[PDB]
């Protein structure tokens, strides 16, 4: 169980926890660091309607929390505020010691409603939810996190707000927020830089809502996106 990777001078070699490796030289406990890596390097999709199909609710299992020391600069970080349709809370409050993920290039903040059926929110493929040096297997409310995993080895800022209707089902609808009466309906293909050009163009050209009601926009299937993320 739980293999310790060995950075040999050539390359990375997994070591057996059953066989005895005499090639290992371990002369500190500073030579043991527990590093956490992000999923978005593996090539998963990153946009919210292609991500929250991998989250579900379930009841009757307690959370578990493990720490990790070093992490990866994230490209996307999420944050949730989901309420039940009667008005109660879905996700549990953050315990003490829980802080947001520290380095985030974009922060998807999502609020809204959904048929919350469960006690917590787990990751359907078995990944963790990385926090401030803490890997957890739930999603605590109101704390900026990423998606990713943890590996053990031997060594030698921009905010985008959303509105979500029907969060837990398969037939969900997301809304991009520009102004608090101005929304744009998402698609599957929207990248964050395209959305940044979108609120620039909307908020500059005066096409926000000039009345009391909401204003929802569609995008024609003619307009490209700005963008392997790292090329």
């Amino acid at each position, epitope marked *: 169980s739980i293999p310790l990777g060995v950075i040999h001078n050539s390359t990375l070699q997994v070591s057996d926890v059953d066989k005895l490796v005499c090639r290992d030289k371990l002369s500190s406990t500073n030579q043991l660091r527990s590093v956490g890596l992000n999923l978005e390097g593996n090539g998963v999709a990153t946009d919210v309607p292609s991500v929250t199909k991998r989250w579900g609710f379930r009841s009757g299992v307690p959370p578990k929390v493990v720490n990790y020391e070093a992490g990866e600069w994230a490209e996307n970080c999420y944050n949730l505020e989901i309420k039940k349709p*009667d008005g109660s809370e879905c996700l549990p409050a953050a315990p003490d010691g829980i802080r947001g993920f520290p380095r985030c290039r974009y922060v998807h903040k999502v609020s809204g409603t959904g048929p919350c059926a469960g006690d917590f929110a787990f990751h359907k493929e078995g990944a963790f939810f990385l926090y401030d040096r803490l890997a957890s297997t739930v999603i605590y409310r109101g704390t900026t996190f990423a998606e990713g995993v943890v590996a053990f080895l031997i060594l030698p800022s921009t905010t985008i707000r959303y509105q979500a209707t029907g969060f837990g089902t398969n037939e969900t609808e997301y809304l991009f927020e520009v102004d608090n009466l101005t929304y744009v309906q998402l698609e599957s293909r929207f990248t964050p830089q395209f959305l940044l050009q979108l609120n620039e163009t909307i908020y500059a050209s005066g*096409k926000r*809502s000039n009345t*009391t*009601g909401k*204003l929802i926009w569609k995008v024609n299937p003619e307009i490209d996106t700005t963008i392997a993320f790292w090329e």
Partner: antibody
Amino acid sequence: QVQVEESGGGVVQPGGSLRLSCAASGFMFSNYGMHWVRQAPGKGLEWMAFIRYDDSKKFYADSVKGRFTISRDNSKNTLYLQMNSLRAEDTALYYCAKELLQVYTSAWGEGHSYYYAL
Amino acid sequence: IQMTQSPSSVSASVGDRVTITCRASQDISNWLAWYQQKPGKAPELLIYTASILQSGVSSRFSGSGSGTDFTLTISSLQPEDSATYYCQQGKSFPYTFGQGTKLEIKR
């Protein structure tokens, strides 16, 4: 100007079924959402159903789930309502209602407003 | 998803100023509507979203509020308003609403 008219009423046995025809003219019918609102002749209003403009979602009241089915056709400019398993409390007037929106086409892509009311 | 109005039978004479209190079980944030149902008639929109008077209706009708406690207000009562007034909302889409207030003219 804008005409919204109900049709297809009458009398029916308990446990039966019928269909209403809410025809309308005078506006771009494929771009506006439509409603159904119930009023018993001894009581007030109560909502029944709502369909969007593109027939993407269908929203039903609690006491009418399963039994009642909304549908629309943007060809004949006509709203429909299919009813099954009728009961004695359902004796009422049935209103079909048009909602409010302005159509802001002056962009790269369309979209509209709501201010939800009838 | 519930909504409860002022008492259903309010009586006044011509020229009076009357108010109708409307209470909501959840936070709605200005998604309300006031409908005037004359007898023998289809209802008609007075004020959508608790602020804007609809065209065609005179200025004696007004309304305001914040959150869950809104209030429709008639400035001066006219004899052409023997009707029952409803208080509808549209926030979370079960579209449920109040029971109604019938305003009686003292004749």
